[PDB]
């Protein structure tokens, strides 16, 4: 997150880290035993940290639970980046507290111009790299699909939306992939991709979660 702020302990309790000896992706806790992240974050034997705000501390009201299942969307299109959604079943339900709680799935799709909260531990610089210790946060509005397809000719599918600033300054960045985009208290997006970080006319692209709730609910039902 570039141009963001320190979230605070307790501020984003549905944020998780995907870990395999190091942090590589954000995720979203959607119930005590189910996490959403990006299909492009898929990795063998992922371990989920929950209740972490400082990513470089070994204790602090935290939980470290192995994936029992990592289920990428069966239409995940690694050529087009389409259907960039993954569900992780945890091996055991998380214990809930001030720093660990679920986000809910949206009733309906969020409309262009709605303000959202994006969070993660990715790079905080536009040119160079600075990784934060603490979770960072950004309020980013949703852009029209015409604005989005314009920014990225040929690449914006129906299962993607753009959020952020075509003016520059503020965006997701490397290491934020798979993290939450929350609008009106619902998970509307998953951090996917963009041309650089915080550049003019090059906003963030997010997986449109409202399109996937039937699948998620059905995948939870059956697994």
């Amino acid at each position: 997150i570039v141009g963001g702020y320190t979230c605070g302990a307790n501020t984003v309790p549905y944020q998780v880290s995907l870990n395999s000896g190091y942090h590589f992706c954000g995720g979203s806790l959607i119930n005590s035993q189910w996490v959403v992240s990006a299909a492009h974050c898929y990795k063998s034997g992922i371990q989920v940290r929950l209740g972490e705000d400082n990513i470089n501390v070994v204790e602090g009201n935290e939980q470290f639970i192995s994936a029992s299942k990592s289920i990428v969307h069966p239409s995940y299109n690694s050529n087009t980046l389409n259907n960039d959604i993954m569900l992780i079943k945890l091996k055991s339900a998380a214990s809930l507290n001030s720093r660990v709680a679920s986000i809910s799935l949206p009733t309906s799709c969020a409309s262009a111009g709605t303000q959202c909260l994006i969070s993660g531990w990715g790079n905080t610089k536009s040119s160079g790299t600075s990784y934060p210790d603490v979770l960072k946060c950004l309020k980013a509005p949703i852009l029209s699909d015409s604005s989005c397809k314009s920014a990225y000719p040929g690449q914006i599918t129906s299962n993607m939306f753009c959020a952020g600033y075509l003016e520059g300054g503020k965006d997701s960045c490397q290491g934020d992939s798979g993290g939450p985009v929350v609008c009106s208290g619902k998970l509307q997006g998953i951090v996917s991709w963009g041309s650089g970080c915080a550049q003019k006319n090059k906003p963030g692209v997010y997986t449109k979660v409202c399109n996937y709730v039937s699948w998620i609910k059905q995948t939870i039902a059956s697994n």
């Binding site: 190091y22 590589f24 992706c25 990006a38 492009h40 974050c41 898929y42 990795k43 690694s78 050529n79 087009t80 980046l81 990715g122 790079n123 536009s126 040119s127 160079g128 790299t129 990225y152 690449q155 997701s172 960045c173 490397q174 290491g175 934020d176 992939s177 798979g178 951090v191 996917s192 991709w193 963009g194 041309s195 650089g196 963030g204």
Partner: protein
Amino acid sequence: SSVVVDTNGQPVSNGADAYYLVPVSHGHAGLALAKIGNEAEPRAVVLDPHHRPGLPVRFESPLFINIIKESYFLNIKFGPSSSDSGVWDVIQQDPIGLAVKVTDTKSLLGPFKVEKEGEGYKIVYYPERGQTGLDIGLVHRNDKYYLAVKDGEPCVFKIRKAT
């Protein structure tokens, strides 16, 4: 689709870090620029026996992740991360053929992938994302190995972080 790994067993970063490509078949060879055809300025990407450990590259993906998977379509570039010079592409040019060259623009998604090959990695060029790959190898011409499409005959690299 595994994670690309440097020689110290660390995942290769998305743009943050530069890496020497180290051939395992040409100890004295390193990456550099050469002229091709009629060009005043060197724009073709060569291995030079006269030049180890080489000019370093960055592997760049639009995905908001700081690891590179063998499955990610990449931009490969000489020079600084954000900058838009030294971006690799393939150009049909004599006397070399489908030559790896540098240019001043960048696409959203590069045409290159890094792939496990026997004991190391090869660069694979994809003319389009749906299609199978063309291994990058070497054309020995005028005393140097120009990188170029030679499918079935890849050049094998280890990826040493420049540090």
